[model samples]
Target: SMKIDVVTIFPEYLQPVRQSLPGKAIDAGLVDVAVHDLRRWTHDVHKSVDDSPYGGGPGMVMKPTVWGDALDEICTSETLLVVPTPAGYPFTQETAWQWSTEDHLVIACGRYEGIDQRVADDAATRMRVREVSIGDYVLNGGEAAALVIIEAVLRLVPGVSLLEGPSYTRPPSWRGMDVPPVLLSGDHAKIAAWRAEQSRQRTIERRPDLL
Candidate 1:
């Protein structure tokens, strides 16, 4: 079973993991998941995790001390440390598939300007480390991105893919819209062909890069 641990100040933001497919995965013994509060490692009265950028900048950089202590305790040789950031490499389907095969994943969710660069650098010396971004656009913090990454990777642990294309349910006719007739025809070959074509067209129109 794969193990996943997320470290963040807003542990509540990662709570959804306890109730959805992720929850089901844990219950089924397919994976083990945990969420940690970064503040737990802080020694200061205010429990600050960030500080002003060393060279001077607009926002605070996450303090290396706190992150160091947290990761030092959580990671082992088998751990894959995943740090989410806007400046990192893109998180793609292939990446998720690759991660799904790992024994353990530790996600460090940073806020403010971002985590200290040294956090990832130092972790790299002892364990596998990767910094990744969910998309071209940036978010307020990495909690959302962690959720995206977690769900994507967890779903694949059970072996699923995206080539199926759009899906529809009962009440085929609704608000002048109807489920594609090919799906209702009950011809498996024709339905499969239609789905493949639709998947290709949708990808070409929306994310040509996937082609």
Candidate 2:
């Protein structure tokens, strides 16, 4: 079984993980999950997690000591610390497949400008640390990105073949658009070929970098 620990300032944002398929997986004993509040380790009265940038910055930077304390308590030798950031490496299907095999995952959800670089630097000395980005765009914080990463990685703990191009239901035709004729055809070979071609085309148009 896998163990996942998520550290975030807004722990409520991650409550959805306990209400869906992830919840089912937890109930079935396939995975153990815990949501932690970063502020829990703070000694200050305000439970502060961020401070003004060292030089000059528009947004506050997450304090290294707070993250260090949280991570030190959560991570172990086999743990992989996943930090979601817009500037990090791309998070792809390959990443999901790789991460699914991990014994433990600790996702640090950064807010404001982001967590201090030294956090990952220090954690890397003891455990595997990866900074990943879900897409090219930016979000207000890493909470949503962490959710996306969790869903993608968790689904793979179960299975995947390739990029599913499009899906059609029994209605076939709806809103003046009809399901591709090849999909409705009885020939399996034709349907497979059509679906493969659609997947290729969609990939080319939307993610040329994937090729």
Candidate 3:
């Protein structure tokens, strides 16, 4: 089974992992996702995991102690530690395929101002830490980013859904980037050519840094 461990301040946010996004995988036991509450490591009802930045910033930063404990106790040999943020590398089809090859993943949800630098640093030294992001914009939380990654990667796994034979699929358009006309054509060779150029152009137009 592919195991995914998510560290989040709001565990309730991940409930949809059981109800949507190819959740059938969870029901069929093809996927194993454990959501750990960062607050669990805190002592009281206050469960304060954040505080105003030391440098006098506008927002609060996630505390290192509890975050460190969560990472240390839970991360394992098969884990690919993923941090979702605007500073991260752009998430893509290739990334989804890469995760499908791993047996386990650890998704850390940073909030407010961000996690303490030491926690992020230690995680980088211990595991395959990657700053993975969904798009150019920012979000309120990382749970959604982690879920988005799961849904796409799960589809690439062998037994998650139907079809035993190999078949290629198309990515849905964003902005004005529609699928090429040749994709609808019966000619496989033309479809392949069109797809390659479409992917190239779309990447160049939307995110040239990826190129």
Candidate 4:
């Protein structure tokens, strides 16, 4: 079984996880996930988790204290701590596949400018740490990135529908576009060939870097 614990201030943003494959995985007892409000670790009345950067910056940086307390309460030697940030390593299908095999995952979702670097450094002392980025662009926070990562990981989990390549439904013709002729031919071998070619062509056109 896999267990994922998400620590973020925007827990509601993750509602989609509870509605789709992830929800089904939870129901089937294949996976367990808990969304935690980071504010619970704050000691101040304001429950703030960010502060101004040391050298002076525009937006506030997440505080290490709150993150420290939170990780201290949950992290262990067997946990895989995933920290999402724009400056982190590229997150990819291969990474998701590898993560799906982990027994426990602790995701630290950052907001504002970013989280305190020390939080990740400290977590490394007790658990495996991976800093990952979903794309080149940025988002309002890591919550959205975390959602994407979770969905990707969920697909790779056994029996969670990890269907790949292109997909199609009825209404063969929509607007001016139409499904490829081979896809409707009913010849399994020809359909497979067409899909393989289409997948390669699409990948080359969009993400040739993967080649």
Best by TM-score: 2
Provide the lowest-lDDT 10-residue window in model 2: 155-164
**Model 2 misplaced stretches (Cα beyond 4 Å):** 22-24, 159-163, 175-177
Each model's backbone clash number: 0, 0, 0, 0
Model 4 earns a TM-score of 0.85
lDDT of 1 by residue, 103-146 (tens): 99999999838898888998999899999999988888999999
**Candidate 2 residues 1-211, lDDT tens each?**
7788999999999998856554566667788768999999897999999999999969899999999999999999999999999989999989998999888999999973789999999999999999999998988799999898888888878621345699889798889999888877799998988989989988888878778
2 versus 4: better lDDT goes to: 2
What local lDDT score does residue 130 receive in model 2, on the 0 to 100 scale? Answer: 97
Best by lDDT: 1
**Which residue pairs come into collision in candidate 2?**
none
State, as a TM-score between 0 and 1, how close model 2 is to the true structure: 0.89
Tell me the whole-model lDDT of each prediction, alpha carbons only. Answer: 0.89, 0.88, 0.78, 0.86
Count of clashing pairs, candidate 3: 0
TM-score of each: 0.86, 0.89, 0.73, 0.85
RMSD of 1: 2.8
Evaluated against the true structure, the overall lDDT of model 1 is: 0.89
